[PDB]
């Protein structure tokens, strides 16, 4: 029954970067990166921060919520990854990422 | 470490009142604040999470608000089951911290304690210790100063005191206080008295015994 | 869906304790576990958290170095060890499922385990009378450890009875009193101290 991050669109004014989790467990926040290397760039964090550009379709403060879809210039282009983190200490841990979405 | 400060420490209320309790975080914790209820002998129980989300099954009587540093739990139309201690808890980061707690107790009319003293007994005295017990029965509010006097001299450091939880039927409290002395020193003094001060007595009632 | 904790412990200062907590009725590994303790008459104190998925831990500063939390995924059990025990570790210790998505909260709780840390050694109570709307009672004195139980006339007499919370004396031993407001029968406080196999029945005579 392993959790999956369903990034439905291979490719996508306010763009919408769609994410859906199949499970709540293991518990932990949903984060977005542009790209994936040691240089990847954070775009949203459910756990902490202020992201005036980014906005969420569903109330991520509800325990049972599985919709992690966000409503976010040519500088914006790139591959986006919805990453599910599992709780850790000192830091959370990449659990599963969706396959990626190319913003054009 | 994020310090959580809960105000007030005690609230008194009658069935049907609205009660509001507050929690202040020493810094911003977004809306990651939970509230628990604990009754005597029981594990805490989660009522509200993320500042305002009810847990499934929790009555709509309860609700919560706030973001950043200031937060509120409200209990509308209090019922006998809602009389308890409530704790807030920050959930933004380790280490997890709880507030100090707010006790919600039943308002009723002022009632004065019925006072009784109890000397030690020969059996106890045969051991080599003496306990003199004062009982303040069935009073309200909780606040009561008990002072022990031995041959008209005020005692300090040599008594301990215990309170019952508010009573099921009458919403009142009782209090026991025990003065503990050597056999040697119990028998060198003569008059043993407990003076009780309380919001429902005109003058401080005293009860005594001479040996 | 529950957490079932091990039984009450009685330890000596400098000793060690290990409390267990068995989960059932949910996917254990999906969630965290935290331990929270409460000393007598006090509030709640968070001790630490452990990921049931990867075993990452975080402990309160105060307890770093003396505490260890582990899990056994094979049995869905959480364990808390606490070392170099002092008197002020005396408290009820709770296990709680930590179940927030991107916050921490505790939605399922164990019933608690009492840990008593003291120099003292098991001892039954001496029971003395508080000789007689009138009032009378029973002074249960110098026992260890918690708890004791007090009935009046074998459960028969219930009304206007007030059995007081025990107080811990400078001796390291506990004392409480049970009072009873009678109208101005025979009376017999029934004291039971399970931990010393000790049970006393004493009659408060005028």
Residue numbers in the entry:
A (entry chain A): 2 to 13, 19 to 78, 82 to 113
B (entry chain L): 1 to 211
C (entry chain H): 2 to 133, 142 to 193, 199 to 220
Question: How is this structure described in the published paper?
Answer:
CD47 blocks phagocytosis by binding to signal regulatory protein-α (SIRPα) found on the surface of macrophages. Upon binding to CD47, SIRPα tyrosine-based inhibition motifs recruit src-homology-2 domain-containing tyrosine phosphatases 1 and 2 (SHP1 and SHP2), which cleave phosphate groups from the tyrosine-based activation motifs of Fc receptors on macrophages (5–7). This process prevents phagocytosis via the dephosphorylation of myosin-II in macrophages. Thus, the binding of CD47 and SIRPα represents an important immune checkpoint needed to maintain immune homeostasis.
An alternative strategy is to target SIRPα, which has a much more restricted pattern of expression than CD47 and could potentially reduce the risk of on-target, off-tumor toxicities. In this article, we identify BMS-986351, a novel, high-affinity, fully human mAb with modified effector function targeting SIRPα. BMS-986351 demonstrated broad binding coverage across SIRPα polymorphisms and potently blocked CD47-SIRPα binding at the CD47 binding site in a dose-dependent manner. The inhibition of antiphagocytic signaling through the CD47-SIRPα blockade allows macrophages to exert their antitumor effects. In vitro, BMS-986351 increased phagocytic activity against cell lines from solid tumors and hematologic malignancies, and this effect was markedly enhanced when BMS-986351 was combined with the opsonizing antibodies cetuximab and rituximab.
